[PDB]
Structure formats: structure tokens, C-alpha cells
Amino acid sequence: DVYAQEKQDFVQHFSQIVRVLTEDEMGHPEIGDAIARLKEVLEYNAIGGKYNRGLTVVVAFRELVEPRKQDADSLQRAWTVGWCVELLQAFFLVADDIMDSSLTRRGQICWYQKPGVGLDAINDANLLEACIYRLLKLYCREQPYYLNLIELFLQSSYQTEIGQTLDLLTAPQGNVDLVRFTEKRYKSIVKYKTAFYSFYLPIAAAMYMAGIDGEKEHANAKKILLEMGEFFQIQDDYLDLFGDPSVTGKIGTDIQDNKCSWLVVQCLQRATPEQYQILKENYGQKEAEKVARVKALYEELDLPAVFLQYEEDSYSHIMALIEQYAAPLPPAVFLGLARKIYK
């Protein structure tokens, strides 16, 4: 497994990331205390996940750049850009946990729920984002791809925020939101909120790093990667309710938070009028008994088996897309990514 193969060196590179983001302002001691807060923010929030998005940059880089051009400096730039993707994700999560009223993330209390943090986490989150562009400068400013990367990261953020906007608009708190929860709206949400940044962004970054900047090559990669992302989000929704928090590292809130989850969309497609009424009376509310009623409804409708069938069909569909659209890139680039998310 090529992700495990590159993991340790990537993770160990974190000290260097923290060191260069702390040391770059030893020349300005009056900001010492801000810098220490940044360090604490990085350490709590950018560590502890599975690093698949950052690692994807690195594995993809190795597979796309000719080995004779993989000098020490270029690898360092690749582990740095990988970390920039993880930092983007850290910004997103910290803010999302606040907006979702989440309890835990990566096996510990959400950063904003820490005593003494609260809504200060808003600024903490944005600092994680600013770190991306300082690292791109410190490590990549003299590279021909520098601007492409800056623009990639900015556009990825914009798309992602557009997708968060739809996530929030589709799920107003304290309303009955069932008529809003359609398959078409679902696919739009997850394309924008998850697929661009989680799948297109890391591979695209590696592409530009390798000097593959053609529009057609990016469009083809995107066809594969945006569909993987849609599956990834469906799985995220499944696990919100049915996954083991011991393994997910986080407690699910989709039902309480009234979300257009893949589960509620599949529920609506199947429910009788009587089942619809049950979902209407119990969805999007904080009472444990009501959440439990929704979960029972889902189980009565065999939504776990439906997801398992969907996963098999999605995997086949993605693999067909790889056959179609991978060339001229190594298919291994897409296949390693698929092996990581299906299972």
C-alpha cells in the first residue's frame, strides 16, 4: 500500500512545517504569543487524522514526476504542498464543527468546545488557512507552478464555501426541511463542499507540480475525481449514523442538525406516507428519542444494505471512469486513491 509507504516521512515532515511557520517570525518577538497560539492550533487540529488528502499529493507526485527529477528539494516541496492540503482541511473542520454544533473530532473534543477557546476558534481556523499561502511562498515562490498552486487553493476554497452555503441553506434549523432533500440537490452539495477539495485539489496540485497544466488533462482527471468525491461524501453521511465513533473519531449530528444527508434522501425515496410523517415529526431535532426514531426508520427501510449495494455499484462506475479518462496519467494514481476509500 503506497500510502503507508509514504506516511511516516510525511508525518515527520510536520515538525519542519511547524518549525518554519514558527521561525519565520523570530525577527518579530512582539508577536511571540500569537505564534505560540498558532502552534497550539496546528498541533491540536492538523494532527490525528488519516492524512489521506495530503498524502495523495505526495503519492501522486512520485507517480507523475520522473524519478531523476525527484531531488531532495522537490520532495520537500511535495510534502509541503501535501501539508497545505491538510491545513486547508484543518481550517474547514474547525469552522464546520462550530457550525454543526459537533462534540468530538479525531478522537477528542472539538477545538471550539475546549474551555477557553469557544468562538475564538473562528480566528484560529482562518490562521490555519493563512498558513497555506505562507508555506506556498516560502517553499514554491521560485517555481513555474507557483501561481497555478495559489490559484488552485483559492478556487478550491471558494468552491468548498459555495458547497457549505448550500449545505447550510438546505438545512435551516428548526424548520421541516424534507421537501428540500432531493437527489439533485444532494449531488450539487457534495460536489462543491467535498469533491473539489478532497479529490481534485490534491491530484491537481501534484499535476501542476509535475508541469502537467493542460486544461484537457485537468478536465479528464476531474471527471474521475469529482465522482470519487461524491461517493466519499455518501460514505461520510452513512458513517455519521452507522459508523463506529471509535473508528470515525467523531459523533454524528446530521439528523439533529437537519442535514440533506444521503441517508435522508434515500429514506424519502422509499418511505410510505406514514413513514414520511414519522420522519417529519422526528428529523432535525435535538431530542435523543427522536433521533433514535429516525435511525430505526432507516433500519426498517434497510438503508445499510442499500448503502452497501451503492458502494459496490459506485466502485464499478469509478473504475470504468478510470478506464475511460485516466490516460495519459498512470492509472495507479487513481487506483491507489480508490483502494483507500473503498473497503
Ligand X SMILES: O=P(O)(O)C(Nc1cc(-c2ccc(OC3CC3)cc2)ccn1)P(=O)(O)O
Binding-site annotation: residue ranges for dimethylallyl diphosphate: 105, 193-194, 233, 250, 259
Phi-psi category of residue 115: left, alpha or beta, with phi > 0 → left and psi -120 to 50 → alpha: beta
Which lies closer to a copy of itself via its Cβ, residue 3 or residue 145?
Answer: 145
Interface with Mg ion in residues 147-166 (CB under 5 A)? none
Closest CA to 254 of 186, 187, 190, 171: 171
Note if 236 is an active site residue.
Answer: yes
Contact pattern from residue 150 through residue 169 relative to ligand X, giving x for each residue in contact according to CB under 6 A and a dash for the rest: ----------xx--x-----
**Distance between CA atoms of residues 93 and 128, nearest Å:** 11
At 255, is the secondary structure helix, strand, or coil? coil
Contact 45, 110 (CB under 8 A): no
| 34: contact with a copy of itself by CB under 8 A | yes
Contact 5, 118 (CB under 8 A): no
Note if 39 is an active site residue.
Answer: no
- State the catalytic residue, choosing from 97, 177, 237, 257: 237
Which lies closer to a copy of itself via its Cβ, residue 5 or residue 175?
Answer: 175
| Residue for grid cell 487513481 | 334
| 119: contact with a copy of itself by CB under 8 A | yes
Which residues are 129's β-sheet partners? none
At 105, is the secondary structure helix, strand, or coil? strand
Among 52, 80, 194, 314, binds ligand X (CB under 6 A): 194
Which residues are 108's β-sheet partners? 105
What is the smallest separation between the CB atom of 19 and a copy of itself, expressed in angstroms?
18
Closest CA to 192 of 224, 220, 155: 155
Interface with a copy of itself in residues 128-147 (CB under 8 A)? 130, 133-134, 137, 147
| 100: contact with Mg ion by CB under 5 A | yes
**Distance between CA atoms of residues 180 and 241, nearest Å:** 20
| 218: contact with a copy of itself by CB under 8 A | no
- Number of residues in contact with Mg ion under rule CB under 5 A: 4
What are the DSSP calls for 65-90, one per residue? S-GGG--HHHHHHHHHHHHHHHHHHH
Beta-carbon-side half-sphere exposure of residue 141 (alpha carbons within 13 Å): 6
Among 56, 164, 194, 258, binds a copy of itself (CB under 8 A): 164
| 157: contact with a copy of itself by CB under 8 A | yes
**Distance between CA atoms of residues 295 and 242, nearest Å:** 9
Which lies closer to a copy of itself via its Cβ, residue 33 or residue 215?
Answer: 33
Note if 91 is an active site residue.
Answer: yes
Closest CA to 228 of 325, 327, 317: 317
Binding-site annotation: residue ranges = 50, 53, 89, 96, 100, 105-106, 193-194, 233, 250, 259
Q: How many helices (H) and strands (E) does the chain have?
A: 15, 2
Note if 124 is an active site residue.
Answer: no
Given Mg ion, a copy of itself, ligand X, none, residue 193, with its beta carbon under 5 to 8 Å by kind, binds ligand X
**Amino acid in position 220:** N
- State the catalytic residue, choosing from 7, 77, 191, 193: 193
**Amino acid in position 7:** K
Given a copy of itself, ligand X, Mg ion, none, residue 199, with its beta carbon under 5 to 8 Å by kind, binds none
H helices of 180-287, where? 183-190, 201-209, 215-242, 245-248, 262-270, 273-282
Given Mg ion, ligand X, a copy of itself, none, residue 154, with its beta carbon under 5 to 8 Å by kind, binds a copy of itself
What is the smallest separation between the CB atom of 100 and Mg ion, expressed in angstroms?
4
Residue 64: count other Cβ atoms within 10 Å of its Cβ: 18
Q: Which residues bind a copy of itself (CB under 8 A)?
A: 30-31, 33-35, 37-38, 95, 98-99, 116, 118-120, 122-124, 126-127, 130, 133-134, 137, 147, 150-151, 154, 157-158, 161-166, 168-169, 172-173, 184, 188, 191-192
Residues in contact with ligand X by the rule CB under 6 A: 92, 95-96, 100, 122-123, 126, 160-161, 164, 193-194, 236, 240
Active centre residues (catalytic): 50, 91, 96, 100, 105, 167, 193, 232, 236-237
